[PDB]
Scaffold this active site. Structure first.
Site, PDB file in Angstrom:
ATOM      1  N   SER A   1      -0.824  15.761 -11.718  1.00  0.00           N
ATOM      2  CA  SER A   1      -1.003  15.263 -13.232  1.00  0.00           C
ATOM      3  C   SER A   1      -1.245  16.802 -14.023  1.00  0.00           C
ATOM      4  CB  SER A   1      -2.108  14.443 -13.280  1.00  0.00           C
ATOM      5  OG  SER A   1      -2.467  14.187 -14.568  1.00  0.00           O
TER       6      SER A   1
ATOM      7  N   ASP B   1       0.905  -1.106   0.028  1.00  0.00           N
ATOM      8  CA  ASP B   1      -0.169   0.158  -0.198  1.00  0.00           C
ATOM      9  C   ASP B   1       0.931   1.195   0.107  1.00  0.00           C
ATOM     10  OD1 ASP B   1      -2.131   1.774   0.318  1.00  0.00           O
ATOM     11  OD2 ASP B   1      -2.276   1.429   2.407  1.00  0.00           O
TER      12      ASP B   1
HETATM   13  C1  LIG Z   1     -11.513   9.283   3.072  1.00  0.00           C
HETATM   14  C2  LIG Z   1     -10.485  10.014   3.373  1.00  0.00           C
HETATM   15  C3  LIG Z   1      -9.175  11.024   3.634  1.00  0.00           C
HETATM   16  N1  LIG Z   1      -7.982  10.067   3.371  1.00  0.00           N
HETATM   17  C4  LIG Z   1      -7.749   9.454   4.517  1.00  0.00           C
HETATM   18  C5  LIG Z   1      -8.309   8.999   2.020  1.00  0.00           C
HETATM   19  C6  LIG Z   1      -7.114   8.079   1.972  1.00  0.00           C
HETATM   20  N2  LIG Z   1      -6.993   7.015   2.331  1.00  0.00           N
HETATM   21  C7  LIG Z   1      -5.677   6.365   1.842  1.00  0.00           C
HETATM   22  C8  LIG Z   1      -5.610   4.620   2.272  1.00  0.00           C
HETATM   23  O1  LIG Z   1      -6.214   4.553   3.611  1.00  0.00           O
HETATM   24  C9  LIG Z   1      -4.364   4.313   2.141  1.00  0.00           C
HETATM   25  N3  LIG Z   1      -4.255   3.177   0.739  1.00  0.00           N
HETATM   26  C10 LIG Z   1      -5.371   2.901   0.577  1.00  0.00           C
HETATM   27  C11 LIG Z   1      -5.805   1.406   1.205  1.00  0.00           C
HETATM   28  N4  LIG Z   1      -6.830   0.784   1.386  1.00  0.00           N
HETATM   29  C12 LIG Z   1      -6.674  -0.262   1.765  1.00  0.00           C
HETATM   30  C13 LIG Z   1      -7.551  -1.420   2.206  1.00  0.00           C
HETATM   31  C14 LIG Z   1      -8.503  -1.022   3.036  1.00  0.00           C
HETATM   32  C15 LIG Z   1      -9.520  -1.868   3.286  1.00  0.00           C
HETATM   33  C16 LIG Z   1      -9.292  -3.317   3.074  1.00  0.00           C
HETATM   34  F1  LIG Z   1     -10.154  -4.370   3.528  1.00  0.00           F
HETATM   35  C17 LIG Z   1      -8.086  -3.604   2.283  1.00  0.00           C
HETATM   36  C18 LIG Z   1      -7.272  -2.668   1.964  1.00  0.00           C
HETATM   37  N5  LIG Z   1      -5.360  -0.688   1.813  1.00  0.00           N
HETATM   38  O2  LIG Z   1      -4.874   0.704   1.333  1.00  0.00           O
HETATM   39  C19 LIG Z   1      -6.644   3.800   1.315  1.00  0.00           C
HETATM   40  C20 LIG Z   1      -4.854   6.890   1.310  1.00  0.00           C
HETATM   41  S1  LIG Z   1      -5.467   8.646   1.297  1.00  0.00           S
END
Ligand SMILES: C#CCN(C)Cc1nc([C@]2(O)CN[C@@H](c3nc(-c4ccc(F)cc4)no3)C2)cs1
Ligand SMILES: C#CCN(C)Cc1nc([C@]2(O)CN[C@@H](c3nc(-c4ccc(F)cc4)no3)C2)cs1
Length: 330
Positions: free
Chosen positions: A199, A35
């Protein structure tokens, strides 16, 4: 040093990708979701509440001769979808594709939310954002990449995600056979702890390119491409019958449609996402309404170049003193 590991979609939709990771001595192999949008390496473990484990492979630190409790350290994280997990921390030897870090913080889950329990194929997450986002308290911990960086031949890792197919994460080197043309590098801001970049614009299908700055993050842990409502509306307006559904939670389109491609700008270069990559299939089994792979970022607060976008490219995460992101077609 270098490492190279294959990453595999967990299902027929490319909802996420898992990569085998060796933890402890003798090795315990867990399939982790790499991730680039978070910075914790956490695992289902022998400490995870039993009712919250459903088929995952668990890490058992008591069976590892190299495991050590990181005394007093705890962690707690939420993700953009509302999922969460928390627990305590061990240090142990962690290897990815032949690249070994000793003393890596391995965050052992005591609790996980329902989405993690339901994903029997995901044994944990390996965060690859900047270590400033790591949630371990009271002593913040470094990511696997940050720990490996000084030993790597080059302070980089690359993501080469497949469309309904396996792909590759490489550490420490750029595989010049894995892409076509040149890699276009673009500046990264670490101010929010993400691989955040701008971008240069977009095009829909065979349309002309719209030059416009779109700040967003390169996030291998997010399934879809989340862009401003204006951009997303311009895309879906080209698909007969496509609409935003409050009941479904985003844009859907008739499964009878053929989707246009979507192009995003990287500097003066262009990455073309084929229309098929934007089709996430029926919203439920047998439905003729299909879920779109491009969705609005409104209310997320950030644009996210997730797997839909990243899998159309060979992507370099350059963690040099001045970090950059590179994109090449493939
Ligand atoms: C809403 C809002 C504001 N902000 C926090 C959004 C953002 N959120 C992220 C991440 O939390 C980091 N990367 C992504 C990710 N989701 C998962 C995941 C989740 C559930 C599962 F069951 C399996 C995998 N794994 O990585 C999302 C970055 S910015
Ligand atoms: C169908 N549904 C999907 C999902 O990707 C699976 N989870 C859903 C979701 N993810 C997010 C999200 C992700 C990252 C963030 F940073 C913030 C929010 N919000 O809803 C949609 C694939 S096919």
């Amino acid at each position: 040093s270098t490492g190279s590991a294959t990453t595999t979609p967990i299902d027929s939709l490319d909802d996420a990708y898992i990569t085998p990771v060796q933890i402890g001595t003798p090795a315990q192999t867990l399939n982790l979701d790499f991730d680039t949008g978070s910075s914790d390496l956490w695992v289902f473990s022998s400490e995870t509440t039993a009712s919250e484990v459903d088929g995952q492979t668990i890490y058992t630190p008591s069976k590892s001769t190299t495991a050590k409790l990181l005394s007093g350290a705890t962690w707690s994280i939420s993700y953009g979808d509302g999922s969460s997990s928390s627990g305590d921390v061990y240090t142990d030897t962690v290897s990815v594709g032949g690249l070994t870090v000793t003393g890596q913080a391995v965050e052992s889950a005591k609790k996980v939310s329902s989405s993690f329990t339901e994903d029997s194929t995901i044994d944990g997450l390996l965060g690859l954002a900047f270590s400033t986002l790591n949630t371990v308290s009271p002593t913040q911990q470094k990511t696997f990449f940050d720990n490996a960086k000084a030993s790597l031949d080059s302070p980089v890792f690359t993501a080469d995600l497949g469309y309904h197919a396996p792909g590759t994460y490489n550490f420490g080197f750029i595989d010049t056979t894995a892409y076509t043309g040149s890699i276009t590098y673009t500046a990264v801001s670490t101010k929010q702890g993400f691989w955040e970049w701008t971008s240069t614009g977009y095009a829909v299908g065979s349309g002309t390119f719209k030059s416009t700055s779109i700040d967003g993050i390169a996030d291998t842990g997010t399934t879809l491409l989340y862009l401003p409502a204006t951009v997303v509306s311009a895309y879906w307006a080209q698909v007969s019958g496509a609409k935003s559904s409050s009941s479904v939670g985003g844009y859907v389109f008739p499964c009878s449609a053929t989707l246009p491609s979507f192009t995003f700008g990287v500097g003066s270069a262009r990455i073309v996402i084929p229309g098929d990559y934007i089709d996430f299939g029926p919203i439920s089994t047998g439905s003729s309404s299909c879920f779109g792979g491009i969705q609005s970022s409104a209310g997320i607060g950030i644009n996210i170049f997730g797997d839909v976008a990243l899998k159309a490219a060979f992507v370099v995460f350059n963690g040099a003193t001045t970090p950059t992101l590179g994109f090449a077609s493939k």
